[PDB]
């Protein structure tokens, strides 16, 4: 696995190898939820390497990733319903979201925010804690780090209320993320607009 990593880290060859690897991976995307650990671990690692390569050289590799982003998101969401291990398709989405935080171009291509947020809320709502309440943590992190600009996230802000309350009573990382988000919302809004949004969960919010 070091050979792809070495090729992706080098400035000269990173774009072409990233494109070739992405084209290859979008044909095997259906094996991510195969329930065989050896088959899925390698695919997930390859996807992670490609996304990190995109992160390293933003001004060169963003155009390589642009064609595939909508396909990746939609296919993951659609395939997770029939897979043997459907959590892999959300580990992949976590890897993707952790790499494009900041300022990019694909925020414009992301115009499926309501669908993704509604799906994440439904998944968060109906799930036994499972292997420790870790699925809840995964879905909350996916909710609180969706790639978008605050202006486009101002609507659909009621989709972040329950995950925020869930995050304010969790480990250190989620607590910090929730505090960051709440401070941002308080600083970048007016009371007459924000209070109605927070009314449904305000008691639990202040108690937490």
């Amino acid at each position: 696995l070091h050979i792809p990593q070495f090729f992706l880290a080098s400035e000269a060859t990173s774009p072409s190898f990233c494109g070739i690897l992405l084209r290859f991976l979008m044909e095997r995307i259906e094996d991510v939820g195969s329930a065989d650990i050896k088959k899925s671990s390698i695919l997930l690692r390859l996807f992670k390497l490609a996304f990190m390569a995109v992160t390293l050289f933003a001004n060169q590799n963003e155009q390589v990733l642009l064609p595939h982003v909508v396909d990746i998101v939609t296919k993951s969401i659609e395939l997770s319903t029939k897979a043997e291990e459907p959590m892999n398709y959300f580990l992949l989405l976590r890897s993707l979201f952790r790499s494009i935080g900041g300022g990019k171009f694909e925020h414009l291509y992301k115009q499926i925010l309501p669908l993704l947020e509604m799906l994440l809320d439904v998944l968060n709502n109906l799930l036994m804690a499972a292997r420790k309440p870790a699925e809840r943590d995964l879905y909350v992190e996916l909710c609180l780090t969706v790639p978008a600009r605050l202006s486009n996230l101002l609507p659909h802000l009621s989709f972040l209320m329950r995950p925020l309350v869930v995050a304010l009573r969790a480990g250190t990382e989620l607590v910090g993320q929730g505090l960051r988000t709440l401070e941002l919302c308080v600083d970048n809004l007016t009371a007459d607009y924000l209070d109605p949004i927070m009314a449904p969960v305000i008691d639990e919010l202040m108690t937490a």
């Binding site: 774009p15 072409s16 494109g19 070739i20 064609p67 115009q111 499926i112 669908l115």
Partner: protein, 401 residues
């Protein structure tokens, strides 16, 4: 669903037609009524389960589905005809249209062609003829787009089923059937794959059934595709895809010189400086290369008269590859292989005619090694004797090559 299957299998062990029908009590009459009541639900899985269960019950009792569902057809038909189809939400409309389509397939006379059915069919035609912006506005949202696509598919399916009935539109003589065909053609050029497939199936079925086509209707259908093929700068992949679909549908309708015009367009697009700059990078994702590949993709769909462009296309592809410094691989190899695999005798004869040249035997060997080049391999296996004979003639001729 599995539990329901097992229960139904168990309870119909010794079924008979008398028990599955109301008396002139019957065990399965209530069950059949309840299952039939769910055929117009707003959930597609529910409808599929209900129809599967009804078919399973009918098979066990050795009866016909129309026989079982005849008594209760009103319970489903009455509510559908009682409201205007244009005011309901998307899911209810889709369920209603699917229910009517399934009901009018059990037998020819199951659903009479009364005023209500005609009004429903006109509403379906109007819906299929509408625009995304008109249908509540397309905000680019995923769910609204999906609902619109599903509604269009359902409308196309119901209209296609109505086409099969010689009564529909015959007694009117008004532009109903021509309008249906025009709507089908308009849908065949959309940007959505499911509607494209539905329209293609409907059009091929209607073409097979009619066996003939008025000249004016086909001219109207074919005008839009040929309109956009008159300018190199405006050529796009979608237009070429539409042309390919039409060529696949109407086989013996098109004419020659379209391939020559396409080759002229290809020559125009392939600028030397443009290719020189396109080298040094992964050009597989460029738009111009995609357009060139789309143009080359058509030649395997044209009628047999296209067989005379083999040398031109091979030379074009080889020159393009030479300009880009590529070997063994390029976006143009797959359509070229598809085209060459249709004329094994011609390609083999042409290649053997130029055995002395090293630039063509290499290309043919590369072609044969692809997994999909099976007919060519069969022809070569058959004519290995001719191949060896010509090679022996060349070697015995006494030259330095």
């Amino acid at each position: 669903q599995v539990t329901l299957e097992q229960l139904l299998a168990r309870i119909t062990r010794n079924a008979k037609k008398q028990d599955c029908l109301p008396p002139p009590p019957p065990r399965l009459a209530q069950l059949v009524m309840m299952l039939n009541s769910e055929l117009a639900h707003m959930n597609r899985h529910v409808r599929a389960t209900a129809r599967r269960s009804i078919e399973a019950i009918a098979a066990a009792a050795q009866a016909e589905v129309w026989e079982l569902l005849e008594p209760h057809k009103k319970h489903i038909l009455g509510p559908i005809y009682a409201k205007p189809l244009r005011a309901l939400p998307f899911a209810i409309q889709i369920g209603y249209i699917d229910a009517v389509t399934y009901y009018m397939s059990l037998k020819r006379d199951f659903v009479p062609f009364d005023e209500n059915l005609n009004r429903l069919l006109m509403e379906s035609l109007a819906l299929a003829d509408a625009s995304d912006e008109s249908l509540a506005g397309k905000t680019l949202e995923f769910r609204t787009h999906d609902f619109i696509v599903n509604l269009r598919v359902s409308c196309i399916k119901i209209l296609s089923r109505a086409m099969s009935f010689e009564e529909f539109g015959s007694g009117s003589n008004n532009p109903t059937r021509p309008k249906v065909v025009s709507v089908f053609f308009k849908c065949l050029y959309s940007d959505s794959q499911p509607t494209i497939d539905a329209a293609n199936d409907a059009l091929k079925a209607v073409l097979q059934h009619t066996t003939k086509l008025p000249k004016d209707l086909l001219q109207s259908g074919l005008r839009p595709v040929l309109a956009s093929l008159q300018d190199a700068k405006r050529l796009t992949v979608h237009s070429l895809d539409n042309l390919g679909r039409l060529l696949r549908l109407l086989t013996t309708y098109f004419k020659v010189e379209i391939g020559t015009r396409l080759l002229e367009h290809v020559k125009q697009i392939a600028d030397p400086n443009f290719l020189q700059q396109l080298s040094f990078t992964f050009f597989e994702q460029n738009n111009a290369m995609k357009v060139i590949a789309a143009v080359f993709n058509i030649f395997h769909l044209l009628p047999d008269a296209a067989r005379q462009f083999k040398e031109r296309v091979i030379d074009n592809v080889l020159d393009l590859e030479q300009k880009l410094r590529r070997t063994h691989h390029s976006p143009f190899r797959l359509p070229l292989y598809k085209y060459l695999n249709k004329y094994p005798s011609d390609i083999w004869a042409f290649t053997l005619q130029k055995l002395e040249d090293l630039r063509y035997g290499r290309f043919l060997a590369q072609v044969l090694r692809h997994p999909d080049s099976q007919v060519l391999r069969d022809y070569g296996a058959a004519n290995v004797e001719f191949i060896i004979k010509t090679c022996n003639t060349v070697v015995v001729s006494g030259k330095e090559t």
